[PDB]
Amino acid sequence: RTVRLGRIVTPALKERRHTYAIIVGIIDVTFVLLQRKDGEREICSVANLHLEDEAFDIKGLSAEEIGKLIPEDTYIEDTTNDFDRFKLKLRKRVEEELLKEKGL
Amino acid sequence: MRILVTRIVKVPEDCTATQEGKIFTFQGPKGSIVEDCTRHPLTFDIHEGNIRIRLWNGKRKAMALAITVESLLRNAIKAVTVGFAYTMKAVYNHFSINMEIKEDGKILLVKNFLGEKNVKRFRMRGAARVRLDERKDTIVIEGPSLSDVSQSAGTITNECKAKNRDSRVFLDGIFVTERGIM
Amino acid sequence: AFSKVNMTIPMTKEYRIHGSAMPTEDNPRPQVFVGTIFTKNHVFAKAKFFKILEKKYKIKATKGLIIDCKEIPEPSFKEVQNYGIRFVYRSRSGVHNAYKECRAISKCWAIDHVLRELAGRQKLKRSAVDIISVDVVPVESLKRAKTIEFADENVEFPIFTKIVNTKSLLIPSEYNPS
Amino acid sequence: EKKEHVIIDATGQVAGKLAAKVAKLLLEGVRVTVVCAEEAVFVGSLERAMDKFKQYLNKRCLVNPRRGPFHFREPRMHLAKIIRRMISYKKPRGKAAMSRLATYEGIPRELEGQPRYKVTCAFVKYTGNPNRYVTLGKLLSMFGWKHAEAAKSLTDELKERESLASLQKKDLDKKIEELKTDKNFENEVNRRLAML
RNA sequence: ACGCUGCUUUUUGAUUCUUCGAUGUCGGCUCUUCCUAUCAUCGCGAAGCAGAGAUUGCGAAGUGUUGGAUUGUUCACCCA
RNA sequence: AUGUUGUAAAGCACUAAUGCGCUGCGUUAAACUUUGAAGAUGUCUUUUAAGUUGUUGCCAGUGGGCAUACUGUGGUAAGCAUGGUGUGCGAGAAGGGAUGAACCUUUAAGCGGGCUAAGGAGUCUUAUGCAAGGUGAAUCCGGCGGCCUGAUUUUGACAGCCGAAUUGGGCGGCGGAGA
Ligand SMILES: Nc1ncnc2c1ncn2[C@@H]1O[C@H](COP(=O)(O)O)[C@@H](O)[C@H]1O
């Protein structure tokens, strides 16, 4: 994978790796200019990025033609206070107590 | 500096290259060769049956290394297709220099050499055979490798030198006179 | 993607100043001067404006007047261009001139980037440098090869630095943290 | 009071950067064993590392060398001495911390199926000299260490029989998977679930 | 050559910080250890190096470096 | 508001020095001065600002000092000897500089709650990161996507027909000999 105009990127930590951005400018070997899904442009260094395997062409795309190519955020808020996640662990305990007498 | 630099090494008809993670293996109609490149920071691959080498953002010491690695690969290619063969000649003033072959061109003995009672003995490097040409006093060294043919000849020259006397008068030794082809 | 340290707001600022000598009744309505200064600090900019007038004319700060001081704001839209920066700097043994092109997103971001490169290559602080001018160079008046090559579109290259993708102290034995 | 235990693997780890972190674990009450102690590395050239070990050997009490400093040539004993000098070991709180450490060349037999860890900051590929280093086993073999071929053997025999144990485990994961997708299976378990 | 720049602590000066209810003050004999700025032995360069004999330089401190006449001598100077 | 001064620097008007060209060019001064600072030092006005002492009794210790920032004199020089202005140790703990009379912070151990200074944040040992370069003298040598100046070249340079850059002087950081 290469640095180029139109490459998709993601942050480096494996958590917080559910957001996206696109490259819209190259300053030197270390610094690029990004545009996030919301409209903001920012300067980041390539030691904080993780290059994805899809790229595009952006020639006349102004700011919104070029902002419809960013994928959407794949994050899910959570629930299940204490009783919701008690049942799921309850369902599995019976399997091993049965799966033991069946060997395996 | 540049953003990219590329070098190409042509692979002829008979040679058949092969690559297992930076290690290159050649096989022509004269033997095989293993040219290992695991320690260099460059990119290798075979493009249209040729060898390609690339370097991104190298300064000047990495660019000098990329051109020396390219010319060691074209030396390994023409070793297993044509081979190498060096020719040496012994010259003297008073004492005849007698030479012998012991194994199948693996050992070379050097007799009298300035009246010495000592007998010098040379062992050829791997995959190189010593022969005896017929001019009057001449040997030939041949094999499918430049590394071993040239190091076997350079040892013989370095070890016949007449210690502790004026080198402008005692001009005896064994020299290389023809770097050629098998 | 976030960087967690803001690199898009520069440390340098720009000010446009009008100044004069302090009026008297032997010299009422004196001459007015104007100029721009790149620095931090409203207060730092006024003192440098008077060191300028004091060395060409002989007007000092204790007998001078500041009439106006304006800070130019950053651009709202961001876009990479080419720049050229005239300056002089002080050495262990004298004063010298230099030119130094580069790429940036504004005039003050381009000065931050030139200072950032003189700190490793010549070991200068920031107070040893004076800026004479900053301007945008179109594409074909470029004097350096490094900017002509990056100013192209369809530029491409891989990167070879590593990446830390976790902030733990111990990782499992077969994990590849990069 | 603590009873935690950690096995640390040193294969591509800078020896000083690992020692400083292993010593902070010992002071906070954790038991550590370092295995494969001959595979830690030193950044640089072999000529630079031999010159530094040669100055170490020169230190010697002239009056009576039996009292004098002791120069260890085994990789497990030498790397244990680098961890000891990271801390104040004459005092009683430091004597206790050194009681919680063990070191080995290769991998011993008892620690065969247990998980190992690496230190995230001591990987040699984060420096600017990746591909210029010396292992602790090659440096020490040039000053007297004999058992360098018997250590590579013992580690590969354990790796191979730790890879077979992974094939038996993976196939049972597929035979148990089909049973969970059964007919008499579910109608049974739905009854045990029925009686809460 | 005429000029110019350094290092050591083996000379002899310059100084007076420590010791005057006391640190036994020259040399030899005996015995051990360290330095290299190497005299010999090992390896190797240069020449106005033909050979022989020497002269000049580099790596190198492992091992060696004596017996006598005259003087208390250190030192000096001769014999083998 | 109104008086006094002859140092630094500079200069040749006096005293004393110093090369040439036949009016100019060249070099000097603790015991030379035609000039001449920064700084010091007198007086008037609180009918200027800001702030808020006079007279006298009985008596002790002390009269070997030393350090330093800046600044002189003698000396080849000295952790040497001897002057000037301020501040310290002496008679000054505590925090920091690994260790230290004098260095930097700061002025003294009652019981609680908050915040900083000097100095620091891999580990001993309380506490985070971002970026650019990189991997003891005279006197010599190399390098850099650094900078300043010149010359040559697609009408084909430099190196030895080929097809694109070549090169002379300097400067500023960095490294190597001298060691
Ligand atoms: N500048 C470079 N240009 C070309 N190949 C490189 C460069 N730097 C490293 N490599 C090679 O690319 C690989 C680097 O990726 P990695 O081994 O994952 O660190 C190795 O195979 C190197 O030989």
TrEMBL record, chain A:
Q: Which InterPro entries match?
A: Rib_uL2_dom2
**Domain of life, per lineage:** Eukaryota
This chain's protein is named ECU06_1215 protein
**Which organism does this sequence originate in?**
Encephalitozoon cuniculi (strain GB-M1)
TrEMBL record, chain B:
Q: Does the keyword rRNA-binding apply?
A: yes
Name the positions where AMP binds.
K22, H40, L42, W56
Query: Which GO terms are recorded in the biological process aspect for this UniProt protein?
Result: cytoplasmic translation
One Pfam annotation, family name? Answer: Ribosomal_L6
**Keywords of this protein's UniProt record, alphabetized?**
Nucleotide-binding, Ribonucleoprotein, Ribosomal protein, RNA-binding, rRNA-binding
What are the protein's GO molecular function terms? rRNA binding; structural constituent of ribosome
Domain named Large ribosomal subunit protein uL6 alpha-beta: which ranges? 11-83
Q: Name one GO cellular component term.
A: cytosolic large ribosomal subunit
State the family it belongs to: Belongs to the universal ribosomal protein uL6 family.
Its recorded name reads 60S RIBOSOMAL PROTEIN L9
UniProtKB/TrEMBL annotation, chain C:
Instruction: List this protein's GO terms for biological process.
Output: translation
Enumerate the InterPro entries for this protein.
Ribosomal_eL20, Ribosomal_eL20_dom, Ribosomal_eL20_eukaryotes
A GO molecular function annotation here is: structural constituent of ribosome
Q: Which UniProt keywords apply?
A: Ribonucleoprotein, Ribosomal protein
Q: In its keyword annotation, does this UniProt entry include Phosphoprotein?
A: no
Family per record? Belongs to the eukaryotic ribosomal protein eL20 family.
Q: What is this protein called?
A: 60S ribosomal protein L20
TrEMBL record, chain D:
Q: Which GO terms describe its biological process?
A: negative regulation of translation; translation
What GO molecular function annotations does the UniProt record carry, in alphabetical order? mRNA binding; structural constituent of ribosome
Q: Which GO terms describe its cellular component?
A: cytosolic large ribosomal subunit
User: Its domain of life?
Assistant: Eukaryota
Q: Does the keyword Ribonucleoprotein apply?
A: yes
Please give the InterPro entries that the UniProt record associates with this protein: Ribosomal_uL13, Ribosomal_uL13_euk/arc, Ribosomal_uL13_sf
Read off the SUPFAM superfamilies from this record. Answer: Ribosomal protein L13
Q: Per its UniProt record, what NCBIfam families does this chain match?
A: L13_A_E
Protein's name according to its UniProt entry: 60S RIBOSOMAL PROTEIN L13A (L16)
What species does this protein belong to?
Encephalitozoon cuniculi (strain GB-M1)
